[PDB]
Amino acid sequence: PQAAVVAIMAADVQIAVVLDAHAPISVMIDPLLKVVNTRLRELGVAPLEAKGRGRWMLCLVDGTPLRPNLSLTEQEVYDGDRLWLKFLEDTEHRSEVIEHISTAVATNLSKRFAPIDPVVAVQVGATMVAVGVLLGSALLGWWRWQHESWLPAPFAAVIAVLVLTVATMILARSKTVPDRRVGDILLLSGLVPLAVAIAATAPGPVGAPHAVLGFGVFGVAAMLVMRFTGRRLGVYTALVTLCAAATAAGLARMVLLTSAVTLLTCVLLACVLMYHGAPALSRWLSGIRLPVFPSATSRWVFEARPLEGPASVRDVLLRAERARSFLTGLLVGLGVLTVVCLAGLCDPHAGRRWLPLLLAAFTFGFLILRGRSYVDRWQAITLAATAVLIIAAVAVRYVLVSGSPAVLSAGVAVLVLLPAAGLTAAAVVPNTIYSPLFRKIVEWIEYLCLMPIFPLALWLMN
Amino acid sequence: WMLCLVDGTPLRPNLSLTEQEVYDGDRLWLKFLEDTEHRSEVIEHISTAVATNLSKRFAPIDPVVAVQVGAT
Amino acid sequence: DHQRRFGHDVVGIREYQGQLVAVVTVWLPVEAVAARLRQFDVRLDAIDIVSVGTDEHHTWLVLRMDPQRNVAAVAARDSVAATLAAATERLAHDLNGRRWTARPLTSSEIDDMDATVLAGWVSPRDITSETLERLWLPDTEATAVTVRLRPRHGGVEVSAWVRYH
Amino acid sequence: MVIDDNAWFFALADQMSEADAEQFAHQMAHWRL
């Protein structure tokens, strides 16, 4: 009959066992415990013990217990799976009763929800002062856009230097806690008024020189904070991606007099190239020996534990998480750049308008390749989100300024039907199963979307 | 024909049940095996807590999430 | 690099861009080692069968494993090296028992194996399953014959190549 | 001792399956003291 080979884990030891694939768990659990205790005692490891009243049980590694009355088969234990053996502590006790309504309300809420706390309060204050200083900096930028006054730049500079010194003092003095994210929030908040202060010093009417100067200095600061801090690096990766593209556009509008369409098509080309290059670049950026403040998952692994030994697993884990964060930041930045360039291209009142819609569709498919290919949940979701936002941005870019019921009805119809198809591909399709051949053919089609961009990039450039 | 324990390790055919520590109420699987050697001696020392912890938060996209993403 | 672990054997390891380890084994053996690319937790990069000889008939498995694809497994264990050492001891103990015996190489003997593989050219073959025992037959002072297994999808797909002299 | 003659709620029974009983019996059979 069938047998499942599985590696069970119990008392910090994993042992591979071959199990009767369709005996009920209630049959096998006891001699499995005896075998595990024999193996542990042979290893000199302290054996398993029944800590008071309770029961011996087996769980999936995700934590859920197996049905003891059921066999491995009907609960989908397959070969190569893993199981966690436990003595579950007894659950049952007196079911207490508070008869008075008011006291029962108070005790249930207090027991079950979390109050406000000064740890949270400081973070809230940091968030609100971050929002305030971005509003102030964006407001001064709006005024310098509207008016030629030199005086906003001293205000932006002084608020930037005050918040940056405050952030630095908090990061230096209060580094002892994971609430140093207060300092990180303030520093992220205060690099922006510095950028608009440097940008507003460019004389004459506002435009490309101000833009290239501000984005260049903000990207430079975002690059420095990697080497000096190395904390919360996904958002700075997205920001330095956006500033790199904006600075390339500003130098293209100053050194040359290129049109906007040429530059947007250049930016799209750079985007799809970078999407192809992003995982490799991330694995490069994984090892830049920047400072080693661990992140949340790494901290909460390190609390449970004390090229060989601990330092190797620690380096591997930190390296992997830095890779994941860089990759996620990159993909978010590219997603923003991709939607902003596609929105900038698809003016409805242009004679070439049919072409960038093709560019949109090709990019949409190409992004969906990566979405199905990349492993991290929030990266697949990033790719899917930006792909949708392409369609939404170009649709609104048409229908807002093109005052016709025709384009309106077309946009709103695709805007409701297309995500419903995107849902349908997983909602009705059984567990999103398709054949490997069909999958590879879909990968061929969305790859065959890419090489049409190259001549279209030439044709929209000229 | 040869008797294996629940994990699959066989019993020694030249030893009694007491000498191999088999007591009353024990379950023995009766099997026909092509060979007399089928053990897998390799133990791994793995920390069970992090092992059972980290799996749920390094998982790839599960279609039950993807449905929610689509619905959003 | 080298280790002796809480297991049973001493295991040599090399690293450059990822970890490398090799097992010697001592007519045809079973081909089904493709399953051991996907152990209970670790995911290995490739299984390469390696063989060399004239006389001097030697046969090897060299295994590639990326830690960064395996971090979820390594994080549970006290070392990345201990992880791959255990997984190779698993493969060695799985092969061992029949007429052919198997053990992990010491890294010194890994450099010995590299020297014997060098000892100082035809096409890679598209269809290979029948070829192996006759592809040894062309006259040479030294032949190196090897087969590669890689996880293209949930299956495992095969390539083989050879050189002479 | 009975306090009053009227039948009333007493308990919800700790019912146990045949498999659990058999499992406990395979445990108890291990001992001879």
Question: Quick one: which of A288, A396, A277, A382 has its CA closest to A336?
Answer: A382
Inter-chain contacts counted by CB atoms under 8 A, chains A and D = 14
Q: Which residues pair with A178 in a beta bridge?
A: none
Q: Which residues pair with A400 in a beta bridge?
A: none
Q: What angle is formed at CA A430 by the lines to CA A426 and CA A431, rounded to 5 degrees? A: 65
Sign of the C-alpha dihedral, residues A197, A201, A203, A207? negative
Q: Please give the backbone phi and psi of residue C162, each rounded to the nearest 5 degrees, phi first.
A: -150, 155
Q: Do A308 and C77 touch (CB under 8 A)?
A: no
Task: State which H helix or E strand residue B64 sits in.
Answer: helix B63-71
Task: State which H helix or E strand residue C103 sits in.
Answer: strand C102-104
Residue carrying the six token digits 């797909």: C157
User: Residue B39 carries which DSSP code?
Assistant: -
What tokens appear for A431 in the block? 């567990």
- Position A162: which residue type? L
Q: Which of D18, D20, D23 should one mutate to test binding to chain A, selecting the residue with the greatest count of A CBs within 10 A? A: D23
Sign of the C-alpha dihedral, residues A18, A22, A27, A29? positive
What tokens appear for A423 in the block? 């849902």
List b or e across A249-264, with b for residues whose CB sees 16 or more CB atoms inside 10 angstroms: bbebbeeeeeeebebb
Whether chain B has a CB inside 8 Å of the CB on D29: the answer is yes
User: What's the Rg (C-alpha) of chain D?
Assistant: 17
What tokens appear for C87 in the block? 């997984």
The two most distant CA atoms of chain A are separated, in Å, by: 86
CA within 13 Å, CB half, C164 = 10
List b or e across C63-88, with b for residues whose CB sees 16 or more CB atoms inside 10 angstroms: bbbebeebbbbbbbbbbbbbbbbbbb
Q: Which residues contact C154 (CB under 8 A, 6 or more apart)?
A: none
d(CA B6, CA B23): 14
User: Residue C98 carries which DSSP code?
Assistant: B
Task: With beta carbons less than 8 A apart as the criterion, state whether A313 and A298 touch.
Answer: no
- Position C93: which residue type? H
Q: Which residues contact A303 (CB under 8 A, 6 or more apart)?
A: none
Task: With beta carbons less than 8 A apart as the criterion, state whether A4 and A79 touch.
Answer: yes
Residue carrying the six token digits 């049109």: A259
What tokens appear for A398 in the block? 């048409």
Cα–Cα separations (whole angstroms), residue C108 to A307, C11, C65: 18, 11, 20
Sign of the C-alpha dihedral, residues C36, C37, C39, C45? positive
Structure method: cryo-EM
Helix (H/G/I), strand (E/B), else coil: C17: coil
CA within 13 Å, CB half, A103 = 5
Whether chain C has a CB inside 8 Å of the CB on B23: the answer is no
Smallest Cα distance from A6 to chain D, Å: 23
Whether chain D has a CB inside 8 Å of the CB on B25: the answer is yes
Question: Quick one: which of C142, C100, C86, C93 has its CA closest to C119?
Answer: C142
State the first-to-last Cα distance of chain B, in angstroms, to the nearest integer: 60
d(CA A239, CA A244): 8
Task: With beta carbons less than 8 A apart as the criterion, state whether A178 and A119 touch.
Answer: no
d(CA A111, CA A105): 10
Helix (H/G/I), strand (E/B), else coil: B72: coil
Q: Which residues contact B4 (CB under 8 A, 6 or more apart)?
A: B10, B11, B28, B29, B31, B33, B38
Cα A421 → chain centroid: 24
What tokens appear for A333 in the block? 């930045």
Q: What is the dihedral of CA A238, A241, A242, A248, to 10 degrees?
A: 180
Q: Which residues contact A294 (CB under 8 A, 6 or more apart)?
A: A302, A318, A321
Using a threshold of 3 CB pairs under 8 A, tell whether chains A and D touch: yes
